[PDB]
Design a protein around this ligand. Sequence first.
Ligand SMILES: COc1cc2nc(C)nc(N[C@H](C)c3cc(N)cc(C(F)(F)F)c3)c2cc1OC
Length: 466
Amino acid sequence: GEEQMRLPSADVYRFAEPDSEENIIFEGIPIIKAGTVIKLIERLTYHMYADPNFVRTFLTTYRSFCKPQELLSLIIERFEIPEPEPTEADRIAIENGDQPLSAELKRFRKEYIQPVQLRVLNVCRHWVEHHFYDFERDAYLLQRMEEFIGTVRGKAMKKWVESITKIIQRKKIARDTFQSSPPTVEWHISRPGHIETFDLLTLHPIEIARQLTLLESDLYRAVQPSELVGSVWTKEDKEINSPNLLKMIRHTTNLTLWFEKCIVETENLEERVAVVSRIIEILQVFQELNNFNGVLEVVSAMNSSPVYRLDHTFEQIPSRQKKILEEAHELSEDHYKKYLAKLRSINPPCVPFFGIYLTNILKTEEGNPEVLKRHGKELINFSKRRKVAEITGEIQQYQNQPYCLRVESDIKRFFENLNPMGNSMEKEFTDYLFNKSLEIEPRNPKPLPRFPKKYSYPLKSPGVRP
Ligand SMILES: COc1cc2nc(C)nc(N[C@H](C)c3cc(N)cc(C(F)(F)F)c3)c2cc1OC
C-alpha cells in the first residue's frame, strides 16, 4: 500500500523493509524484546519519534552483538537515504527547463530524511559524550567519525555537527570541592615518610580504612557499564575492554589475600589474635564510612578456608568484636537482603559492594540466550542486554559520591602495591595459606604447639575513636 510505496526500495536501501515476526519482536513507545542488527539500527534512528531510553541501552550494550567499526558503518549507511524519482508530470517539467512541483519529494525529505538524519547525529552525539573510550581505543574509528560529521551539509545539521565536535575536543582535552575540611591524618607506630616500617599493625587502623576507602571509591567510579556487558572481563579480550573492572577485582583479591596472609603467617596465637582484632577494627571504620566493599572484603577473608577454621584465635576475640563480624556476614545472607536494605537507607557518600553486580550480571548472561529464533531466523535478544544495562545503572547511581578525607600518598602507594602472592599463582598461594593454617593450629587429635613471637613493637591497638 501507499505506506510502503513512499519508503525506499530494498534494492537501494536496507533500513526500509516492513516489520515482521521474523525480524522484530516487542514486549506510547513500544519496548523492543528482540530484532536483527538492521531492525535495531532502524529503531535506534526511527523517524516517527525519539527514543532516549533505547539509545542509552543500545550504546551501553551494542558491543555484545556488534563491533564499533561495524556500528559506525551501519549508521552512516542509514544516514544515506536515496530520494525518489520525480513524478511523470515533474520529469516533463524538468526536461522543459521548468521548476518541478516535487510535492512527494519535499514531503519525504521533511517527514523521513530530515528526522532520520537528525536521529543518526543524536546517536553520534551520545556515542562520543558517554562512550568516548571506543574512540580512544580505536584512533581509526575517530578519524572515520570526524570525516563523516565533517562532510555533513545542512541548515539544522550545522548546529548538531558543532556540538558533536565540541564534545570530541573536550574529551581529547580531558585526557591531558568539599564544604568541610577533612579530619586529621591519624598515625600509630609508623611515623610519616618511614614507608619501610609500614604494615598492618604499625599504621593506624582508622587511617588504613580511610585510605583503602579512598582507593576503592576511586576504583568503583572508574568502571564503565560496557566493561560488564557480555561477560567481556571473563573473555580473552579483557585487558582493553575491562581495564578498570579488572583493577577493582585484582585489588579485592590482593587485599583479601593480604589479610589472610597477615593472619596465618603470624604463628604466635596471642599475636595472631591481635592481627584479627585489628582487621575487625578496620571493618568497624569501613562501617562508619559506609564502605560496604571494604566490609565484605574483611568478611571474605574471615570466611576463607585458612582463617574460618582458626577456633583458638576467634575464642580470644571479645564478644563485641565477634557480634560486629557476625552481623557483617548477615549482610550477605538471603541474597544480600540486609546489605541492600542498608545501602538504600544510608546517607552518602558510600562505596557499594561491587561483587554482587558481577554475580547478578553473570547469572543474567548465563540464564538468558544470546538470540531468539522465529521462523528459522535468529534475532538478537535485546531484552537480555536491557536487563544487564539496568544492573549497571544501579552501579552508576553511586559513582558521584566523593569522600571528605585527605589523601596520604605514602599509605595510598602501600595499598596500591600490595602483592601477597609474590611470584605464586592464586590457587598455589591459597593452598599455602591453608597448609599454613594447619601448621599453626593442627586438626583436633593433634595437640596445639607454641610458636615464637615475630613482632618487636607493641601489639595494643590505639582504637577506632579519632
Ligand atoms: C554457614 O556458614 C557460615 C555461617 C556464618 N555465620 C556467622 C554468624 N558468621 C559467619 N562468618 C563471620 C564473618 C565470622 C567469621 C569468622 N572467622 C569468625 C567470626 C566470629 F564470630 F568468631 F567473630 C565470624 C559465618 C560464616 C559461614 O561460612 C563461612
